[PDB]
């Protein structure tokens, strides 16, 4: 099996930690959801190819501009996350995260991932956002941002229901192999 | 790690570590606070274990089996002995706090009510200055260590056989040389996330809410100082490149 490295980036409330936990855990966390993620090496078989995919989180490093880039050496694929319940997390993608990742990870494929897709049809979420003249991120807004930043592709998932989670990591493995 | 501590921290949470008849005696808020304190101690035990893999398995193994040029092992594992001393002492204090809190006749039922004071002590005074100095040096030497590793693995057969041998066991799957270095660099930025979540469930005793608020502030000051003191060293960098 070939070894590849994945790093997830995005704003503090984007759901990156929860996404790594749900993908990596054997059973869904029904008793306690961890605060942090250390690392993990997933055994993935995608399109007949076996890969050892090392997973890393940048949670906690968002305010530390000299510590954060130490997570990037030899990254093979970037998952760039935003939360669908946070239109503001999507706005920081082209201004901050994209130039940073392109600088430290040249030529590395970026998959733009819209997290918490289950909140798009959540009445409490829609009520809260409507007070700030906002609404949950639309699928076309996610695709357009991904197209604009030169992302390898656009994907959505929900860590809460697990929908789309396996597909995200299988596609990230395919991107890392190209 | 030692068997006693591994078994004490084998469960996924504090609520699954204690007896169910003990869990039932506590309010939901106490359980939520204890689950996050348990995660802080469990991840500290794992972090000390990562440092022991670096010092005992890799570093010492290379000195005892390989003929590496002097100053090479130090370049691969900068500050590992100092980091091991800092975190083994901190882990010792966390485990002693848990041990004193055990109910008589039990080796698993406890509640830690006073963590804030231990965190203020760890992240203030000489121990905080030592953490700041050690992480500023470690994180500035991180890129150099990774490049030195890559060079040795690609050009030295005996080094490659040594790495493939000592990393073959399934328990070392997440702990190759480069993985250990990033695990250590990332440890310090996990602390505010854990402390903030403990604080969110520690409002019941005002002295405790105040102590954890002070500790969170000290941890953030340490991180800001380490972040400001980092500049990546590069092997063979010239003075002109540095002062420009
Ligand atoms: C929510 C929950 N928090 N703690 C729980 N325990 C009692 C039932 C068995 C698992 C441990 S459930
Ligand atoms: C933290 C970061 N340090 N440098 C960054 N770059 C953004 C793109 C242009 C070059 C500089 S981000
Ligand atoms: C792991 C998990 N990620 N999301 C979860 N949901 C249930 C609890 C509250 C937030 C939404 S569990
Ligand atoms: C699962 C999780 N539930 N709450 C978390 N916190 C992260 C640190 C700040 C306080 C909130 S993580």
Swiss-Prot record, chain A:
EC number(s) reported in the record: 3.6.5.2
Assigned keywords, A-Z: ADP-ribosylation, Cell cycle, Cell division, Cell membrane, Cell projection, Cytoplasm, Cytoskeleton, Disease variant, Ectodermal dysplasia, Glycoprotein, GTP-binding, Host-virus interaction, Hydrolase, Isopeptide bond, Lipoprotein, Magnesium, Membrane, Methylation, Nucleotide-binding, Nucleus, Phosphoprotein, Prenylation, Proto-oncogene, Ubl conjugation
GO-annotated molecular function: G protein activity; GTP binding; GTPase activity; myosin binding; protein kinase binding
Biological process, per Gene Ontology: actin cytoskeleton organization; alpha-beta T cell lineage commitment; androgen receptor signaling pathway; angiotensin-mediated vasoconstriction involved in regulation of systemic arterial blood pressure; aortic valve formation; apical junction assembly; apolipoprotein A-I-mediated signaling pathway; beta selection
Modified residues ((Microbial infection) O-AMP-tyrosine): 32
Pfam families: Ras (PF00071)
Membrane topology: Lipid-anchor
Chief site of localization: membrane
Name recorded for this polypeptide: Transforming protein RhoA
Organism of this sequence: Homo sapiens (Human)
Lineage: Eukaryota, Metazoa, Chordata, Craniata, Vertebrata
Swiss-Prot record, chain B:
Post-translational modification note: Phosphorylated by AURKA and CDK1 during mitosis, which negatively regulates its activity. Phosphorylation by MAPK1 or MAPK3 increases nucleotide exchange activity. Phosphorylation by PAK4 releases GEF-H1 from the microtubules. Phosphorylated on serine, threonine and tyrosine residues in a RIPK2-dependent manner.
Location relative to the cell: Cytoplasm, Cytoskeleton; Cytoplasm; Cell junction, Tight junction; Golgi apparatus
Sites of N6-acetyllysine modification: 150
Induction: Up-regulated by bacterial peptidoglycans stimulation, such as muramyl dipeptide and in biopsies from inflamed mucosal areas of Crohn's disease patients.
Positions of the DH domain: 32-229
Source organism superkingdom: Eukaryota
Functional summary from the UniProt entry: Activates Rho-GTPases by promoting the exchange of GDP for GTP. May be involved in epithelial barrier permeability, cell motility and polarization, dendritic spine morphology, antigen presentation, leukemic cell differentiation, cell cycle regulation, innate immune response, and cancer. Binds Rac-GTPases, but does not seem to promote nucleotide exchange activity toward Rac-GTPases, which was uniquely reported in PubMed:9857026. May stimulate instead the cortical activity of Rac. Inactive toward CDC42, TC10, or Ras-GTPases.
Domain notes: The DH (DBL-homology) domain interacts with and promotes loading of GTP on RhoA. Promotes tyrosine phosphorylation of RIPK2. The PH domain has no affinity for phosphoinositides suggesting that it does not interact directly with membranes.
Disease involvement: Neurodevelopmental disorder with midbrain and hindbrain malformations: An autosomal recessive neurodevelopmental disorder characterized by intellectual disability, speech delay, mild microcephaly, midbrain-hindbrain malformations, and variable dysmorphic features.
Self-association state and partner proteins as the record states: Found in a complex composed at least of ARHGEF2, NOD2 and RIPK2. Interacts with RIPK2; the interaction mediates tyrosine phosphorylation of RIPK2 by Src kinase CSK. Interacts with RIPK1 and RIPK3. Interacts with the kinases PAK4, AURKA and MAPK1. Interacts with RHOA and RAC1. Interacts with NOD1. Interacts (via the N-terminal zinc finger) with CAPN6 (via domain II). Interacts with DYNLT1.
Name by which UniProt lists this protein: Rho guanine nucleotide exchange factor 2
Organism: Homo sapiens (Human)
Gene that encodes it: ARHGEF2
Range within the parent protein: 206 to 447 of 986
């Amino acid at each position: 099996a070939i070894r590849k490295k994945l790093v997830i980036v995005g704003d503090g409330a984007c759901g990156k930690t929860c996404l790594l936990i749900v993908f990596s855990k054997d059973q869904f966390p029904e008793v306690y959801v961890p605060t942090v993620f250390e690392n993990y090496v997933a055994d993935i078989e995608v399109d007949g190819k076996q890969v050892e995919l090392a997973l890393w989180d940048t949670a906690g490093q968002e305010d530390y501009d000299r510590l954060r880039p130490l997570s990037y050496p030899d990254t093979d694929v970037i998952l760039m996350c935003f939360s669908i319940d946070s239109p503001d997390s999507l706005e920081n993608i082209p201004e901050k995260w994209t130039p940073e990742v392109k600088h430290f990870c040249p030529n590395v494929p970026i998959i733009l991932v819209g997290n918490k897709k289950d909140l798009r049809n959540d009445e409490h979420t829609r009520r809260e956002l409507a007070k700030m003249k906002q609404e949950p991120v639309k699928p076309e807004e996610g695709r357009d941002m991904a197209n604009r930043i030169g992302a390898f592709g656009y994907m959505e998932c929900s860590a809460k229901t697990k929908d789309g989670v396996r597909e995200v990591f299988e596609m990230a493995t395919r991107a890392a192999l190209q | 790690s030692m068997e006693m501590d591994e078994k004490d921290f084998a469960a996924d949470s504090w609520s699954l570590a204690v007896d169910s008849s003990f869990l039932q005696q506590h309010k939901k808020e106490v359980m939520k606070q204890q689950d996050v304190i348990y995660e802080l101690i469990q991840t500290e035990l794992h972090h000390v274990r990562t440092l022991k893999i670096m010092t005992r398995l890799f570093r010492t193994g290379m000195l005892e089996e390989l003929h590496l040029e002097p100053g090479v092992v130090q370049g691969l594992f900068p500050c590992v002995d100092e980091l091991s001393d800092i975190h083994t002492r901190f882990l010792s204090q966390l485990l002693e706090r848990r041990r004193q809190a055990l109910c008589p006749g039990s080796t698993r039922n406890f509640v830690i009510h006073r963590l804030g004071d231990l965190l203020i002590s760890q992240f203030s005074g000489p121990s905080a200055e030592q953490m700041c100095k050690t992480y500023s040096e470690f994180c500035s030497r991180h890129s150099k260590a990774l490049k030195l590793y890559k060079e040795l693995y690609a050009r030295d057969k005996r080094f490659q056989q040594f790495i493939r041998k000592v990393t073959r066991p399934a328990v070392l799957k997440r702990h190759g040389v480069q993985e250990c270095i990033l695990l250590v660099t990332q440890r310090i930025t996990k602390y505010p996330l854990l402390i903030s979540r403990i604080l969110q469930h520690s409002h019941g005793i005002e002295e405790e809410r105040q102590d954890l608020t002070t500790a969170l502030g000290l941890v953030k000051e340490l991180l800001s100082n380490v972040d400001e003191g980092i500049y990546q060293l590069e092997k063979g960098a010239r003075l002109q490149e540095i002062y420009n």
